[PDB]
């Protein structure tokens, strides 16, 4: 739904020190390296300018919800404890900002969700009407279409499309004219590129409906 693009759009028109970190390279082996990489970010951040710390995904480790009576799950659990200690531990105030992005947010820790730590909650819908028009306009604005084939016949369609797959449609019809040696889209291929990417039903075995 256009999540990381919004983080990239902030990095242009800011005067900050933008720091993006994937939430996967600290869930690794070598017990103790995980929580120290959290310290390596913030000591690099708080020594520097007003900065933005964009953690890409924590749909991975973000949830306690049980006491781990096992091995190597308390190491999973304690990275959150290190994350909480240098988020809303001491004051640590001056000009540090943290942005996170996930899937469904009911899974994760309620200790994260108190305000003062994660004050803002923003939900993303998909491509509803009047927003399919705006994304079709802007992508085809910087694209020589040059036909009398109206695109709004695909605005008014059902089969709701994620915002990344709109980008796939206009680029596929770009391939589906140039590969056939056309210096302009003729938009008889635009039907076929639409029907191509919409077929993600796969198999489902015609079973359990």
């Amino acid at each position: 739904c256009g999540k990381t693009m919004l983080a990239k759009a902030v990095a242009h028109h800011t005067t900050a020190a933008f720091i993006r970190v994937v939430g996967s390279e600290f869930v690794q082996k070598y017990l103790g390296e995980g929580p120290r990489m959290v310290r390596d970010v913030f000591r690099l951040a708080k020594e520097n300018a007003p900065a933005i710390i964009f953690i890409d995904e924590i749909d991975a480790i973000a949830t306690k919800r049980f006491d781990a009576q096992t091995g190597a799950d308390r190491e999973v659990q304690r990275i959150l404890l290190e994350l909480l200690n240098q988020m809303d531990g001491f004051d640590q105030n001056v000009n540090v900002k943290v942005i996170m992005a996930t899937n469904r947010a009911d899974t994760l820790d309620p200790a994260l969700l108190r305000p003062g730590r994660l004050d803002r909650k923003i939900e993303f819908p998909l491509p509803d009407r009047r927003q399919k028009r705006l994304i079709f306009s802007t992508i085809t604005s910087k694209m020589n279409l040059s036909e009398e084939v109206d695109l709004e016949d695909y605005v008014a369609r059902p089969d709701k499309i994620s915002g990344a797959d709109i980008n796939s449609i206009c680029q596929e019809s770009g391939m589906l004219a140039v590969r056939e040696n056309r210096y302009i889209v003729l938009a008889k291929d635009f039907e076929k590129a639409y029907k191509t990417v919409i077929k993600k039903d796969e198999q489902e075995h015609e079973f359990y409906k």
Partner: protein, 248 residues
């Protein structure tokens, strides 16, 4: 006032415990649900202690190599003998200090290897003096029953969610620099929180003043708060109800 009895009183007046004839306490545990003032009380003491304050977060005692991930804890507390009155603080012992599990390729040895040194530099062959520890975390039943013994920690202090009389006083502190107009009742707004955390009273105070920012306004009405109550307070929203009625 209980923290004055264990930290201020032995440092300021040690001769009282001489005349009364008891040993002096040194162990403090702070517990409760999240967002109930556990870390201000560390910083409020540290602003007024007139003493050495040693901050240790509870997760850097593992490093990466065995044996040196432990011994600096022994080098930590022996450095506190240099500044002979001192207060050492623990951040969030839901890490190291949890439980002695089994052997095998499960649990962890090295977490226990560090924990046994914490278990012993304050209760070993040599008893220390003028060094006091404060530990603060939730999850009371899952830290180990060898540092919870009252030879180690003498004061266990809860932090319940505040009362309606107490939610009013928290609301007055953060709305102090906030500028309210007139005709506004904080007690009505304090009754709109059926069991708030107390830390989320700030989230009401920030989001109510945020409504005036998008209006290019400095005036804050009571309507700004009542919209901010429904924004901050949420629910789990347990859907499909089949889980509920399997479990009636």
């Amino acid at each position: 006032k209980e923290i004055k009895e264990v930290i201020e009183l032995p440092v300021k007046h040690p001769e009282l415990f001489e005349a009364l004839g008891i040993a002096q306490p040194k162990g403090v545990l702070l517990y409760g649900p999240p967002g109930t003032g556990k870390t201000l009380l560390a910083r409020a003491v540290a602003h007024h202690t007139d003493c050495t304050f040693i901050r240790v977060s509870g997760s850097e005692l593992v490093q990466k190599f065995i044996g040196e991930g432990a011994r600096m804890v022994r080098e930590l507390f022996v450095m506190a003998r240099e500044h002979a009155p001192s207060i050492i603080f623990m951040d969030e012992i839901d890490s190291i200090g949890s439980s002695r599990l089994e052997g095998g390729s499960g649990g962890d040895s090295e977490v226990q290897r560090t924990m046994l040194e914490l278990l012993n530099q304050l209760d070993g062959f040599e008893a220390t003096k003028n060094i006091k520890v404060i530990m603060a975390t939730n999850r009371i039943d899952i830290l180990d029953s060898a540092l919870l013994r009252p030879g180690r920690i003498d004061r266990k202090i809860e932090f319940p969610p505040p009362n309606e009389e107490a939610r009013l006083d928290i609301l007055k502190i953060h709305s102090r620099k906030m500028n309210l107009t007139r005709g506004i009742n904080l007690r009505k707004i304090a009754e709109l929180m059926p069991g708030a955390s107390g830390a989320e009273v700030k989230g009401v105070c920030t989001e109510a003043g945020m409504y005036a920012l998008r209006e290019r306004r400095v005036h804050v009405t009571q309507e700004d708060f009542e919209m901010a109550v429904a924004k901050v307070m949420q629910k789990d929203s347990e859907k499909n109800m089949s889980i509920k009625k399997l479990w009636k």
